[PDB]
Symmetry: D2
Subunit: 464 residues, 4 copies
């Protein structure tokens, strides 16, 4: 692309070449020809006057596409499909008269879109499986590392770095399920005619309903779909595009949340994005990859409104106000998702943790959450609950004033150590303030989660 024209940053800058190719005109028109080859093979099988020589010349010329010629013919014809029937028949002169036999434009246009959507999903699925797997390794590594919990982004009951990572993983697992469900349930349009009635194919087969049904089943199987619609207008219902982009929107919400947490952890200096390759010969580090993931994820959420609106105002058996919008949103949704998953994998590969910063923060906040434990110990040693409460309240106030009014380190535990009133529990104080004892069931939750929910989910993706 020239620097003198706009180039989508989703092609040029962001997405992988594999996803870029799925949405390319090369892939599109090659798949159009592929569909025409399948149609010819099935029509031959069903008794139509098509030869093995005609089939073989189509098969040899699936990739040999004259784009200049197609574009020229599209000018005079003003019909993209017929422009390509012409260009295909030019390089396939024996087969020319039977290309597109009995079909309408959407046999190629709309089935190709479904193949594209399915192949795009099949590119995302393994990438999403891989990021989940890398985060699972991290979660298990850090399963028992105590970290300050945050509710309202204020100190709260301690969690572990790995348990927090499980919140992230779980949302991504829900995405993996949704994506796989939408992919697997996607139906083929098949051979349906202009308004879905198969009137053209019925006539071609001389009123033979069984042959129309069989043809529909054969192209569906050749394209590798399990199932075709029975009911369509001109195209697959545009409710499908809502299903697909809704699950991508939800994925975007998940990633926006995870990468927001990561950016906040980076401010706290508890976690940072992976160190990047050394240049031959820094204190401050910006979580730029997580920022980019948020930025893009937002756009994936935004896009959901396109297919919602499109579907809601489709009139009868189709209106073509779906077409320009789909050319933008379907491709953009997938290229944005791809980019996000490529970046998130890169974030996952060697996340940096600073346990001494984490520890320090716990030591600042934990004492204000440990006071019932200190009361219980005093009471167990023969002390008075009332007096211990009154005394803890006063020392706690003193420490809180050091922290806020003076900008000091929390000295509550040191106040308690120095006060002879707490003499009966001074020897227990390290044990009573052990952060691992305040993480509840965090580490066991990680283990049960990974074994019962995450590994089983990943198992079938081990091939790809």
């Amino acid at each position: 692309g020239s620097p003198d024209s706009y180039r989508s940053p989703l092609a040029s800058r962001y997405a992988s070449p594999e996803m870029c190719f799925v949405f390319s005109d090369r892939y599109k028109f090659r798949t159009w020809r592929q569909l025409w080859l399948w149609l010819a093979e099935a029509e031959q099988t069903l008794g139509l006057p098509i030869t093995d020589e005609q089939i073989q010349e189509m098969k040899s010329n699936l990739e040999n596409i004259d784009f200049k010629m197609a574009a020229e013919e599209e000018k005079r014809l003003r019909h993209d499909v017929m422009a390509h029937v012409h260009t295909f028949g030019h390089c396939c002169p024996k087969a020319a008269g039977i290309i597109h036999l009995g079909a309408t434009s959407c046999y190629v246009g709309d089935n190709t879109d479904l193949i594209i959507l399915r192949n795009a999903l099949d590119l995302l699925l393994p990438k999403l499986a891989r990021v989940i797997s890398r985060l699972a390794d991290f979660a298990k590594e850090r399963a028992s590392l105590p970290t300050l919990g945050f509710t309202h982004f204020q100190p709260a009951q301690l969690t572990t770095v790995g348990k927090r990572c499980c919140l992230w993983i779980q949302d991504l697992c829900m995405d993996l399920q949704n994506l796989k469900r939408v992919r697997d349930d996607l139906r083929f349009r098949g051979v349906k005619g202009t308004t879905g009635t198969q009137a053209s194919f019925l006539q071609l087969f001389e009123g033979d309903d069984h042959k129309v049904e069989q043809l529909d089943k054969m192209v569906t199987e050749k394209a590798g779909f399990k199932r075709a619609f029975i009911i369509t207008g001109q195209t697959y219902t545009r409710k499908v595009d809502i299903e697909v982009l809704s699950v991508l929107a939800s994925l975007g919400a998940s990633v926006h949340k995870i990468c927001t947490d990561i950016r906040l952890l980076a401010n706290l200096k508890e976690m940072e994005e992976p160190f990047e390759k050394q240049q031959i010969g820094p204190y401050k580090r910006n979580p730029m990859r997580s920022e980019r993931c948020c930025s893009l994820a937002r756009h994936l959420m935004t896009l959901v409104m396109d297919p919602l609106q499109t579907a809601s105002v489709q009139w009868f058996e189709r209106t073509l106000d779906d077409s320009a919008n789909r050319r933008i949103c379907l491709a953009e949704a997938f290229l944005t998702a791809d980019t996000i998953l490529n970046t998130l994998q890169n974030i996952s590969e060697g996340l940096v943790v600073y346990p001494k910063v984490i520890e320090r923060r716990i030591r600042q906040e934990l004492p204000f959450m440990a006071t019932e434990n200190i009361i219980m110990a005093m009471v167990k040693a023969g002390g008075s609950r009332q007096d211990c409460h009154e005394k803890i309240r006063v020392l706690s106030q003193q420490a809180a004033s050091v922290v806020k009014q003076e900008g000091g380190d929390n000295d509550l535990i040191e106040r308690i150590q120095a006060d002879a009133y707490f003499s009966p529990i001074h020897s227990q104080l390290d044990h009573l303030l052990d952060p691992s004892s305040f993480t509840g069931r965090a580490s066991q939750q990680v283990q049960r989660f990974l074994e019962e929910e995450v590994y089983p989910l990943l198992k079938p993706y081990e091939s790809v």
Copy 2:
């Protein structure tokens, strides 16, 4: 009071049953229910709770002093502790063990899940019922030809019932979505302030097994098959995305269906049980259902760590509104579907005006079959078509293409064929067989469990 704003969703639009599901009575009775279950399970697991305490709670689930709870909430600045205190007031014997070990979201967030599920349960039979009425209609009208439209321009004929199947199929997809979401909803259970169950762990003196039993048992008592293992304070707000996304997609389906119905009313081919007001209302509400999807998308995207409370007010609005809106739509769509009136004579007249321009191909094939040239016959049709089209558009007159073809001696080999060549049923392709196969394979089996 007419002196204050009153939700049009509550007063005007939605059913009393769905309004009740989102009422404070339902909410606070469910808080008490969850406190009962917690005590029952805690007793089984060895905690000092008596049968008398449990029976007292059980006799007072509905006995709620909303005035006291609202006054205590002003004092304590804490809705849950306000309801603990109020419940303890009418249950003095149980008062010390209500909420034992629990945190606020044990009642708040589990109650939301209960509500979401019961609201889906109310929608499910309504949607099946609509699909069923429309299916009866599609079957009745499976063979009735009607003009096809692409670009809202005359196209290959369909049937009234085949078109109806486009509508039915989107609604079947909605039905399956709502059911999946309903069945897959998991319980929060007992999870603590940050999801670690630390408060329960301490209540059980470090016994993990007891914590896991408690979680299993309250989940069972609430009638859920599964609880989360992993939470922060609350169930992941991704769940609310999943729920409102299926409602939004439902709204898109309804808007499309009710748009087609409004267009059919302009064409005088079909009417609702004279303006298509029910269909307009459906569209108007369906649009709001689509808009609402952005609320939970945004919310989940900016939850920090184990929860921020910027979810709360938003969810009070969007969750209830989405369900109350969806309910109204289904009640209205039910009324539309019970009384669709078709005017076959209007349909027939429109077909007779448009069909000739679409029959030019079959006229050419018949001339060929009695000897003629393809290219001669195309050019003869082209001139007569051009003339008929001028009469239609330039003169505002009825289409005379068939009369033109009869009056031209060239078409003598065909003249006696013309009535049959332009029989509308012969242009509907496989429409009626598609209806029957769709109803038997796809719709009936879906509906059978609901009947």
Copy 3:
């Protein structure tokens, strides 16, 4: 009402009584009657058979509204306007025959919607002005107080607490200007008939176009509007609802940003929400609520965008139920947000020693160029000094991250005799006020030039809490 049914929390928990009333049935049907009165007044002036007695009796019974009779008459008739014509005629027996004369439903329905939108904008405006004024006071108070700057939420060139407050204030001033513009530019529908062509009134005035135009002008002026549409279909263009809810959505975005910043400052213990009628751990719950509701305001913009987009011809009635929801909810949501944000703004809590400690931890890493320059001025080498400061800074950075320790960079500089030509200077070189650039002067000029002048019209309502 009853706890046995849904009650919108916008009406029952969140919005002010005044905003709730603007969207009430009482207000709506009083305004219908008002519009009937004005119609009758203008109709008499242009010579229609309407007497002072008939007029005086409508004026007497503007508020005397029997809702039960209106509701039963609507159940019988299934037309809200005719039900209200009949109910108004019942208590105005002498005027009954002239009420609604020559008008169509939207004369009352749609003109009332405009009067509501305008009144609702008028309630928001002074609330937004008060928030701006409280925050201006804060920005002035805190103009010179250094604080750590944040880009990517990482340490950056110091700002001041007041300068950062001006980021918030500016966006709110842009919202105030938008709300006012929209309020001012709102046009009346006036008298337009069923399809915008004024046929009913043309015929009522026996073909006199001048009298139809005068009626339109006169009802418009009686309703307090400067200007009526020339062109309508049945109703005002629904593009208007986009204009109004877009400005509210943008206000939501500003508030969401501001309150997200406050939430982050509260985590950092630098700023907290005002003390309520001293606990160590405090949650920024008002700010969280403002974010929550601001989000809904943003969401709602998609309602009028979609509605306008699919209006067929001179009106389709698929706008009606949606507008009953989104127009009221957006204003009630905005009202709540403004009431809450004004509360947040009254007595914000700042912890300067927390702010100072954080600066002391981060500033040395940003001071290393000021130090190099002071070495270069006393003789030394830019490149020499750069390599020595890099090694010590790396050591200090490792104390911070690998050990969880306080930053010791200035201590390591103090203890290294290579820096002896600048040891006397270090206190001055590390003065935080010298790192805030022009923050304090920016505050002063902004408040003088851009904020105080916007507030000037609202001075008489400024002091309410």
Copy 4:
């Protein structure tokens, strides 16, 4: 290359001029322009910058080595520093003073503002031309009666021109909104990395007036009347909301207009203009699809969808800036303007020679009018129509009944369609003179430019 994806906005849809405004060439020449302006102002303010340094920069604003700059961005990990280095290579005399005292968003963010303003400037005349073509049409059809539609059911007659005025008025509102947003855009200027101008205050050795002078000077050289006083790192992202919200609302207007045209096309009352290849063709198709209208709807829909991107972005900016705005804005701001530009090009084409069939219009009026004239006559046919799809026979029944003898001779006059259109034709004329013409007058000199 057809072997990767390419935005259909760049290749297929938008005009080359809008495409260029969002191009890398435009971007990076604008960086260099801003660096030149900076140097010129800094020279005036006394910094050691020579006329030769300035002239060397001025001679190389367009001489951009994209390949080298990309490679340098990879080495330095910094887009601005890559461009500083690459510009210093072609301007070795100036190399030492390029970007002097500035920070990254001096070029990045000011360039975005120049782009936004340029883009708006391209849209305005296009919209003005649409409005003018429709105003021509409205005027010529001001009196042509046509069936009014409420609920898309027969309602009080309007006129083809009056109906077109509904479309025009929405677009006039868009044109005023676009103009306001363009006029109100402020320059970021020189603000530093957190908005405090610290780097410039240091460059000028603590002289505040010099910093203020530099901000004023770069703002003036860039053609902006006003700079922000207050920024963080960048201009407030509220500005992006303001700009995309006006485009969204334009999208809504265009969707409604093009939905009406599609419905009229179904009714055969109005069609999209004959394409060049069809004009006078003896091969004119009977069935014409309103494809340009469909396209405009489809695109206008995306415009409306995009409004959620800047809403969300602004809402979650933390403090003096977070860089989660960057990728999103790269997408949405360019897409919104390419989509709008496409819509306006197409809509201008639609507006130039709309096809009207008065005899179709007339026949539909005769079907519905007898039912709307009963009031005037007092001074079954419905069941036939509904059950038989027959022609309306109400008038024919009336002339053949004894009872209506007093009225019979008026029945032609009483059914005159012109008498049912109310004030539609006068409304058109007052609207055009008072509200439309005055808005178009600034655009007189570019009215004649053709559809693309």
